[PDB]
RNA sequence: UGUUUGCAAUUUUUUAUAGUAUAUAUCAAAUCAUCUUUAUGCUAUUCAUAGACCUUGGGUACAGUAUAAAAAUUAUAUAUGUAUUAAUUUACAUAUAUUUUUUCUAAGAAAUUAGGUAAGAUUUUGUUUAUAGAGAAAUUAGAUGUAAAAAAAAAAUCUUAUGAGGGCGGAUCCGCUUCUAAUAUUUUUUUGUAGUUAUUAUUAUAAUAAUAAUCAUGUUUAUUACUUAAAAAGCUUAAUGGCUUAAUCUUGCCUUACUGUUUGAUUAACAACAAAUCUUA
């Protein structure tokens, strides 16, 4: 076939598997020793720049996927058992549970302008500025239906701490930053206060907390630890409040300082921290959902109890 | 006052100078300015 | 000139998690422990297993007083059922 | 093969260095003559003196500010830094081998 | 102070000056990684296409069944689409007791427990 | 391929993550520290138990890839090593338990 | 062991290592990845034979049979051909040696695979430059209402490469330049070259006129040719020189 | 031998060969501090050996399930030993004061720095929903929508053109002028709306039709383009205007916050003059 004649004649992909005899004779450690010298360096010595100086600069930076890049992060190390669970059993139950049948020839719904315009016979309406968002001061995202093309999933988790007393005892901020480190496996970024309150002895623009964001597989692993190993150990725990939700599919709740040390990563070396310095955290679970009821329906699929309050 | 007018002398020993202001509690000024006598950019240092 | 920051990640291990049910899965954590035995987890909690009869009708004497009394005076005085 | 190839690398390195030093010696001779040349001109009242603008171009032609160029190459610093480390480690091998 | 110094050392090791540098590969080593990356992203495509194929096939089975249901009459003296209009209700779907926590709490595991399944469960 | 890939990325993480500080989890001269040092020497200094023997730093750091037909990357060898590291190797008094008197997990 | 083998590291590595194809290095992850791409390339080729025969069925099909007429039969084969072109690239885009052969300049430009990487490489750094010169120097709309270059054109005077828009001396720009062109479309086409000076001052009417300094037509070109010396366009290369090279120049005072 | 050790992979330049301008190699620089002892220690085992398990000295190990064959190897000052020599000579074992491996007390935890230029980011405030301690009042997370295979073709309404050097009157000057081309506008006359995956139906695994999905060869934390009322925040300082496509913010390098002369204006600055303001060469 002429089309197949345009493909590369010599294909590495269509080569036979390596020979066992060749495998036996391939010893990378014996080459460096037998050489008894240092092989000359290659003339290609491009190294990613430390700064991005524009799209037209002679020296350009590679993408993060490039292993030599400065922002490269080693890929997945395992499959979070809660992501395989959700995609294996709970992906179709939520799709089947919440399903509305659309007839075959249903006309596509046309979205109406959310920033209305004035229409009428008054000459003033012509050049009037678009009206304000009706209801809330900011337009809320419209809920999408749970389809086979839109399955709510967990996206990222933000663990934040606020230590006001750390302004007087600087060590309260050092411990808080370490607990949030072992808990999530990343380096928290210090935050600062934004208001001034003398009654609470709060001064503005001073480091008073820390925050980490875990994405991808890390966020699915953290959820499992929280659901199956931390929350089941909180004494007299009722469940996540049914009122949680910002109206966009994100669930927020907080842990006590005595419940933060239940994390296996914090109870192992609990004695290495000064007494009464482990803080409480604010866990914000951001999902792909677009509603409060969808997120609460998503978390219930992962084994989160919710109580009325 | 809080501000003082300092004079930057040309190190080419041409006699040209520039005059700028800066707070008292600051380090002496030292800049690379243009000398019209030699028509080249030389080092200018504060007088005192 | 936008600085290209680098990721600052600590050392991470691979851990075997053995739930109270005896089932085992592997995770990625920062602690050096290799095997994490969980004596109390969702597989043993009543809020997650409201139907299992074994978990209900449990003494749950967290303080220890209910057991100290029986050691001193015996099981003569009990809520027999 | 590795030993001989390195000799070719050093031979080509010496050629450039030999030419560079052979040319660097010429520039230092051209600059010396320029900075040492005194052109006295008939200015006024039958007086003779070297113009101030010519005194400014003695250090170098206009366009750049002499004394602002980078003194050396960072590659030579990496090259030099490796050489220093190799001795240090190689030196410890001789000592702990002497013992 | 001693314990806080330990915590501070933990951070001193994570500073940009202490963390290891970016990798430095040759060509054959870089090309070796280029394929491992080219084959992994393609593997995810094969898993993404398969996963999204099952979701579409399971979804089409619902559309077909519900479309048939819409045009049914019965059982008995019940107008067309009664069962359809009753099946599209979402009573309690978005409540607190929607999904049983015993089914959602049980996640997949690498190896089973001492008692994989409980057959002696009684109502 | 999924197994070989994870192992391949676990060794790149060894070259890019901060070192492990045992002083942050174990305190000197304790039953846990001594038990950690003994088993750490059997792993040839590698604090991780599922990446075989690989030194991120040094002259031989480049040899991170594993040859075809290897057992180290498999999941059977992973569980075997993580279990052999869970058995208590140091008695309550700080002495290493005899090889025959060690109870497996 | 001569320079014809490549860099020094290659000549050294090629004498202290074993003789073995790069694709047969016994590495675990590298060979597991090579098998995923192997059985996938076989699925892309199996698809090219499926879509190749699906065109014959549509070709030997009366237009009237199609409810859309002859117009609906060409849009169906037009899409099938385009879908096959993509399968011929995805069959080698993951090949590690096709990437090496291209980066070394030894790539066969008569194949769609190497022409795809060349355009992607050109559209990464070089296109963004020429796209910027056309706008900042106002080549558009002065010369053309709209212009989106699709081929690479690098000009060099006396063997010295010229950066786009560099002010050259009147002595350098005295002989015909050499154009290092590169096309990324299949087949052989006829090319016309035109050098226009768009800033000739016309003081008699207070405006600028455009003057042609070179014009040649009927220049055969293929994606395999790279160099074209405008000096020899009548004898060496085939073409018709409508106007020989006129040395550029600019009178004193004009921009 | 700077640059990762299995092999022509970035940009520019030097030099040389072949070559008649091209091609290869080489050199220097740019981008980047990757850490480099090929084993001198350690580990195991095995011989001897005065020795009642240990003393002293030698061997051995053959390495892809990589290995004992380096998971991090300095240099000393003193004291206390032990064994040693012509000799505090030398080799070890302890401790305690050092320096070395840049390798372990978070500046990427702090500082409100304001001009020139380049790149990057583009609603930052308030409001509001929710959130351990947390309350009227502390922090954090959020808060618009659309699109991303590809079009082809007919006429008309204008508007432009340094397009055809159009034609006619007085090549590029001018008011009338046809034709072609481009932008915009019509809801316009339409034609086409595939391919791929899947479902359903007929037909004999394929073909045809219909329905749904479809930016995706790519680190899904996707990305890119467009859209997202007004006010507010920010912009040295009041107030008004303005900027969000930069005049704001972040970062790199910088100090034109230069010297002389000078153009045209502020319907001929302030209803004169002068000190002024903007601007050109
Ligand atoms: N990712 C893409 O390139 C892509 C392409 C087309 C469409 N989409 C759309 O985006 C949605 C999500 O994209 P996705 O399905 O490719 O994401 P994904 O599930 O494949 O990736 C999720 C995260 O986990 C990692 N991961 C993936 N597979 C893994 C495994 N087997 N083991 C361990 N870790 C693994 C990935 O690296 C990523 O960080 C798709 O459902 C589709 O709607 C994405
Ligand atoms: K996938
Ligand atoms: K700046
Ligand atoms: K707004
Ligand atoms: Mg400013
Ligand atoms: Mg805000
Ligand atoms: Mg006046």
Short mmCIF file of N, CA and C in Angstrom, two decimals, chain G residues 65-177:
data_model
loop_
_atom_site.label_atom_id
_atom_site.label_comp_id
_atom_site.label_asym_id
_atom_site.label_seq_id
_atom_site.Cartn_x
_atom_site.Cartn_y
_atom_site.Cartn_z
N UNK G 65 -26.44 7.64 -5.52
CA UNK G 65 -26.78 6.81 -4.37
C UNK G 65 -26.70 7.61 -3.08
N UNK G 66 -25.74 8.53 -2.98
CA UNK G 66 -25.63 9.39 -1.81
C UNK G 66 -26.77 10.40 -1.81
N UNK G 67 -27.56 10.42 -0.74
CA UNK G 67 -28.67 11.36 -0.66
C UNK G 67 -28.21 12.80 -0.75
N UNK G 68 -26.94 13.07 -0.48
CA UNK G 68 -26.38 14.40 -0.59
C UNK G 68 -25.74 14.72 -1.92
N UNK G 69 -25.73 13.77 -2.85
CA UNK G 69 -25.16 14.01 -4.16
C UNK G 69 -23.65 13.85 -4.17
N UNK G 70 -23.06 14.35 -5.26
CA UNK G 70 -21.61 14.27 -5.42
C UNK G 70 -20.89 15.14 -4.41
N UNK G 71 -21.53 16.21 -3.93
CA UNK G 71 -20.90 17.08 -2.94
C UNK G 71 -20.71 16.35 -1.62
N UNK G 72 -21.65 15.49 -1.24
CA UNK G 72 -21.55 14.76 0.01
C UNK G 72 -20.56 13.60 -0.06
N UNK G 73 -20.17 13.18 -1.27
CA UNK G 73 -19.19 12.11 -1.40
C UNK G 73 -17.76 12.62 -1.31
N UNK G 74 -17.52 13.87 -1.71
CA UNK G 74 -16.18 14.43 -1.62
C UNK G 74 -15.85 14.87 -0.20
N UNK G 75 -16.83 15.41 0.52
CA UNK G 75 -16.60 15.76 1.92
C UNK G 75 -16.41 14.53 2.79
N UNK G 76 -16.88 13.37 2.34
CA UNK G 76 -16.67 12.14 3.10
C UNK G 76 -15.29 11.55 2.84
N UNK G 77 -14.83 11.61 1.59
CA UNK G 77 -13.48 11.16 1.29
C UNK G 77 -12.45 12.19 1.73
N UNK G 78 -12.82 13.47 1.73
CA UNK G 78 -11.91 14.51 2.18
C UNK G 78 -11.56 14.32 3.65
N UNK G 79 -12.54 13.91 4.46
CA UNK G 79 -12.31 13.69 5.88
C UNK G 79 -11.55 12.39 6.13
N UNK G 80 -11.83 11.37 5.33
CA UNK G 80 -11.13 10.10 5.48
C UNK G 80 -9.65 10.24 5.16
N UNK G 81 -9.32 10.98 4.10
CA UNK G 81 -7.92 11.20 3.76
C UNK G 81 -7.21 11.94 4.89
N UNK G 82 -7.84 12.98 5.43
CA UNK G 82 -7.24 13.72 6.53
C UNK G 82 -7.06 12.84 7.75
N UNK G 83 -8.01 11.94 8.01
CA UNK G 83 -7.88 11.05 9.16
C UNK G 83 -6.75 10.06 8.97
N UNK G 84 -6.45 9.69 7.72
CA UNK G 84 -5.34 8.78 7.46
C UNK G 84 -4.01 9.49 7.66
N UNK G 85 -3.93 10.76 7.25
CA UNK G 85 -2.69 11.51 7.43
C UNK G 85 -2.30 11.58 8.90
N UNK G 86 -3.29 11.71 9.78
CA UNK G 86 -3.00 11.75 11.21
C UNK G 86 -2.53 10.40 11.72
N UNK G 87 -3.02 9.31 11.13
CA UNK G 87 -2.60 7.99 11.58
C UNK G 87 -1.18 7.66 11.12
N UNK G 88 -0.73 8.26 10.02
CA UNK G 88 0.63 8.03 9.56
C UNK G 88 1.65 8.76 10.42
N UNK G 89 1.23 9.80 11.14
CA UNK G 89 2.11 10.51 12.06
C UNK G 89 2.10 9.86 13.44
N UNK G 90 0.91 9.53 13.95
CA UNK G 90 0.82 8.90 15.25
C UNK G 90 1.46 7.52 15.29
N UNK G 91 1.81 6.96 14.13
CA UNK G 91 2.48 5.67 14.11
C UNK G 91 3.97 5.79 14.38
N UNK G 92 4.54 6.98 14.21
CA UNK G 92 5.96 7.18 14.43
C UNK G 92 6.27 8.35 15.36
N UNK G 93 5.26 9.07 15.83
CA UNK G 93 5.51 10.22 16.69
C UNK G 93 6.10 9.77 18.02
N UNK G 94 5.83 8.54 18.44
CA UNK G 94 6.36 8.00 19.68
C UNK G 94 7.64 7.20 19.49
N UNK G 95 8.13 7.10 18.26
CA UNK G 95 9.35 6.34 18.00
C UNK G 95 10.55 7.11 18.53
N UNK G 96 11.42 6.49 19.34
CA UNK G 96 12.54 7.26 19.90
C UNK G 96 13.63 7.55 18.89
N UNK G 97 13.81 6.69 17.89
CA UNK G 97 14.85 6.92 16.89
C UNK G 97 14.41 7.91 15.82
N UNK G 98 13.11 8.00 15.54
CA UNK G 98 12.62 9.02 14.62
C UNK G 98 12.90 10.40 15.19
N UNK G 99 12.86 10.53 16.52
CA UNK G 99 13.20 11.80 17.15
C UNK G 99 14.70 12.07 17.07
N UNK G 100 15.51 11.03 17.24
CA UNK G 100 16.96 11.19 17.15
C UNK G 100 17.38 11.52 15.73
N UNK G 101 16.86 10.79 14.75
CA UNK G 101 17.24 11.03 13.36
C UNK G 101 16.85 12.43 12.92
N UNK G 102 15.77 12.98 13.48
CA UNK G 102 15.35 14.33 13.13
C UNK G 102 16.23 15.37 13.80
N UNK G 103 16.54 15.19 15.08
CA UNK G 103 17.37 16.15 15.79
C UNK G 103 18.78 16.21 15.23
N UNK G 104 19.25 15.14 14.59
CA UNK G 104 20.57 15.11 13.98
C UNK G 104 20.59 15.68 12.57
N UNK G 105 19.44 16.09 12.04
CA UNK G 105 19.35 16.61 10.69
C UNK G 105 19.35 15.57 9.60
N UNK G 106 19.46 14.28 9.94
CA UNK G 106 19.44 13.21 8.96
C UNK G 106 18.04 12.70 8.65
N UNK G 107 17.01 13.48 8.99
CA UNK G 107 15.64 13.03 8.78
C UNK G 107 15.23 13.12 7.32
N UNK G 108 14.47 12.12 6.88
CA UNK G 108 13.94 12.07 5.52
C UNK G 108 12.73 12.98 5.42
N UNK G 109 12.89 14.12 4.76
CA UNK G 109 11.82 15.11 4.67
C UNK G 109 10.77 14.76 3.63
N UNK G 110 10.92 13.65 2.93
CA UNK G 110 9.88 13.19 2.02
C UNK G 110 8.78 12.43 2.73
N UNK G 111 8.89 12.25 4.05
CA UNK G 111 7.90 11.53 4.82
C UNK G 111 7.10 12.50 5.69
N UNK G 112 5.81 12.25 5.90
CA UNK G 112 5.00 13.18 6.70
C UNK G 112 5.47 13.33 8.13
N UNK G 113 6.16 12.32 8.68
CA UNK G 113 6.56 12.36 10.08
C UNK G 113 7.59 13.45 10.32
N UNK G 114 8.67 13.44 9.55
CA UNK G 114 9.74 14.41 9.76
C UNK G 114 9.31 15.82 9.38
N UNK G 115 8.43 15.95 8.39
CA UNK G 115 7.88 17.26 8.05
C UNK G 115 6.97 17.81 9.13
N UNK G 116 6.40 16.94 9.97
CA UNK G 116 5.57 17.41 11.07
C UNK G 116 6.40 17.98 12.21
N UNK G 117 7.53 17.34 12.53
CA UNK G 117 8.39 17.85 13.59
C UNK G 117 9.13 19.10 13.16
N UNK G 118 9.44 19.22 11.87
CA UNK G 118 10.13 20.41 11.39
C UNK G 118 9.25 21.64 11.49
N UNK G 119 7.98 21.52 11.12
CA UNK G 119 7.07 22.65 11.22
C UNK G 119 6.82 23.02 12.67
N UNK G 120 6.70 22.01 13.54
CA UNK G 120 6.51 22.28 14.96
C UNK G 120 7.73 23.00 15.54
N UNK G 121 8.93 22.60 15.11
CA UNK G 121 10.14 23.27 15.56
C UNK G 121 10.22 24.69 15.02
N UNK G 122 9.82 24.89 13.76
CA UNK G 122 9.85 26.22 13.17
C UNK G 122 8.81 27.13 13.81
N UNK G 123 7.64 26.59 14.12
CA UNK G 123 6.57 27.36 14.72
C UNK G 123 6.80 27.65 16.19
N UNK G 124 7.89 27.14 16.77
CA UNK G 124 8.19 27.34 18.18
C UNK G 124 9.03 28.59 18.43
N UNK G 125 10.04 28.82 17.61
CA UNK G 125 10.91 29.97 17.82
C UNK G 125 11.04 30.87 16.59
N UNK G 126 11.14 30.29 15.39
CA UNK G 126 11.40 31.09 14.20
C UNK G 126 10.15 31.81 13.70
N UNK G 127 9.01 31.11 13.70
CA UNK G 127 7.76 31.73 13.25
C UNK G 127 7.39 32.93 14.12
N UNK G 128 7.60 32.83 15.43
CA UNK G 128 7.27 33.93 16.32
C UNK G 128 8.10 35.16 16.04
N UNK G 129 9.28 34.99 15.43
CA UNK G 129 10.13 36.12 15.10
C UNK G 129 9.64 36.81 13.83
N UNK G 130 9.51 36.05 12.75
CA UNK G 130 9.04 36.62 11.49
C UNK G 130 7.64 37.17 11.64
N UNK G 131 6.80 36.49 12.43
CA UNK G 131 5.47 37.02 12.70
C UNK G 131 5.55 38.38 13.37
N UNK G 132 6.62 38.64 14.12
CA UNK G 132 6.79 39.91 14.79
C UNK G 132 7.37 40.97 13.87
N UNK G 133 8.23 40.58 12.93
CA UNK G 133 8.82 41.55 12.01
C UNK G 133 7.77 42.08 11.04
N UNK G 134 6.85 41.22 10.60
CA UNK G 134 5.82 41.65 9.65
C UNK G 134 4.94 42.73 10.26
N UNK G 135 4.75 42.70 11.57
CA UNK G 135 3.87 43.65 12.24
C UNK G 135 4.60 44.92 12.66
N UNK G 136 5.76 44.77 13.30
CA UNK G 136 6.45 45.94 13.82
C UNK G 136 7.03 46.80 12.71
N UNK G 137 7.49 46.19 11.62
CA UNK G 137 7.99 46.94 10.48
C UNK G 137 6.89 47.33 9.51
N UNK G 138 5.65 46.93 9.79
CA UNK G 138 4.49 47.32 8.99
C UNK G 138 4.58 46.79 7.57
N UNK G 139 5.16 45.60 7.39
CA UNK G 139 5.08 44.94 6.09
C UNK G 139 3.63 44.68 5.74
N UNK G 140 2.79 44.50 6.75
CA UNK G 140 1.34 44.47 6.61
C UNK G 140 0.79 45.70 7.33
N UNK G 141 -0.12 46.47 6.73
CA UNK G 141 -0.78 46.30 5.42
C UNK G 141 -0.08 47.02 4.27
N UNK G 142 1.16 47.45 4.47
CA UNK G 142 1.85 48.22 3.44
C UNK G 142 1.99 47.42 2.15
N UNK G 143 2.46 46.18 2.25
CA UNK G 143 2.68 45.35 1.08
C UNK G 143 1.54 44.38 0.81
N UNK G 144 1.02 43.73 1.85
CA UNK G 144 -0.06 42.77 1.70
C UNK G 144 -1.15 43.05 2.72
N UNK G 145 -2.43 42.89 2.35
CA UNK G 145 -3.49 43.12 3.35
C UNK G 145 -3.37 42.24 4.57
N UNK G 146 -3.02 40.97 4.39
CA UNK G 146 -2.81 40.05 5.50
C UNK G 146 -1.82 38.98 5.06
N UNK G 147 -0.96 38.56 5.99
CA UNK G 147 0.12 37.64 5.65
C UNK G 147 0.38 36.72 6.83
N UNK G 148 0.36 35.41 6.57
CA UNK G 148 0.68 34.40 7.57
C UNK G 148 1.67 33.43 6.93
N UNK G 149 2.97 33.65 7.11
CA UNK G 149 3.95 32.79 6.46
C UNK G 149 3.76 31.33 6.84
N UNK G 150 4.01 30.44 5.88
CA UNK G 150 3.86 29.01 6.08
C UNK G 150 5.14 28.23 5.81
N UNK G 151 6.18 28.86 5.28
CA UNK G 151 7.46 28.21 5.06
C UNK G 151 8.58 29.05 5.67
N UNK G 152 9.70 28.38 5.93
CA UNK G 152 10.88 29.03 6.50
C UNK G 152 11.77 29.57 5.40
N UNK G 153 12.29 30.78 5.61
CA UNK G 153 13.17 31.44 4.65
C UNK G 153 14.26 32.16 5.43
N UNK G 154 15.47 31.62 5.39
CA UNK G 154 16.64 32.24 6.01
C UNK G 154 17.60 32.67 4.91
N UNK G 155 17.96 33.94 4.90
CA UNK G 155 18.84 34.51 3.90
C UNK G 155 20.21 34.77 4.50
N UNK G 156 21.25 34.56 3.70
CA UNK G 156 22.62 34.76 4.14
C UNK G 156 23.42 35.42 3.03
N UNK G 157 24.24 36.40 3.40
CA UNK G 157 25.06 37.14 2.46
C UNK G 157 26.51 36.72 2.63
N UNK G 158 27.10 36.18 1.57
CA UNK G 158 28.51 35.77 1.58
C UNK G 158 28.77 34.76 2.69
N UNK G 159 27.83 33.85 2.89
CA UNK G 159 27.98 32.79 3.87
C UNK G 159 27.71 33.19 5.30
N UNK G 160 27.30 34.43 5.55
CA UNK G 160 27.00 34.92 6.89
C UNK G 160 25.50 35.08 7.05
N UNK G 161 24.93 34.35 8.01
CA UNK G 161 23.50 34.39 8.24
C UNK G 161 23.06 35.77 8.72
N UNK G 162 21.91 36.21 8.23
CA UNK G 162 21.35 37.51 8.57
C UNK G 162 20.12 37.29 9.44
N UNK G 163 20.07 37.99 10.58
CA UNK G 163 18.89 37.93 11.42
C UNK G 163 17.78 38.79 10.82
N UNK G 164 16.52 38.38 10.96
CA UNK G 164 15.42 39.13 10.33
C UNK G 164 15.43 40.59 10.75
N UNK G 165 15.60 41.47 9.77
CA UNK G 165 15.55 42.90 10.01
C UNK G 165 16.85 43.55 10.39
N UNK G 166 17.98 42.88 10.18
CA UNK G 166 19.27 43.45 10.54
C UNK G 166 19.71 44.47 9.50
N UNK G 167 20.18 45.63 9.97
CA UNK G 167 20.70 46.66 9.07
C UNK G 167 22.05 46.19 8.55
N UNK G 168 22.14 45.94 7.25
CA UNK G 168 23.35 45.45 6.63
C UNK G 168 24.07 46.57 5.89
N UNK G 169 25.38 46.43 5.76
CA UNK G 169 26.18 47.41 5.06
C UNK G 169 25.95 47.31 3.55
N UNK G 170 26.29 48.39 2.85
CA UNK G 170 26.14 48.42 1.40
C UNK G 170 27.15 47.54 0.69
N UNK G 171 28.24 47.17 1.36
CA UNK G 171 29.21 46.26 0.75
C UNK G 171 28.76 44.81 0.90
N UNK G 172 28.19 44.46 2.05
CA UNK G 172 27.70 43.10 2.26
C UNK G 172 26.55 42.81 1.30
N UNK G 173 25.55 43.69 1.28
CA UNK G 173 24.40 43.53 0.38
C UNK G 173 24.74 44.05 -1.01
N UNK G 174 25.74 43.42 -1.62
CA UNK G 174 26.16 43.74 -2.97
C UNK G 174 26.06 42.56 -3.92
N UNK G 175 26.02 41.33 -3.41
CA UNK G 175 25.88 40.13 -4.22
C UNK G 175 24.57 39.45 -3.85
N UNK G 176 24.08 38.63 -4.77
CA UNK G 176 22.81 37.95 -4.55
C UNK G 176 22.88 37.10 -3.29
N UNK G 177 21.87 37.13 -2.43
CA UNK G 177 21.90 36.32 -1.22
C UNK G 177 21.53 34.87 -1.48
#
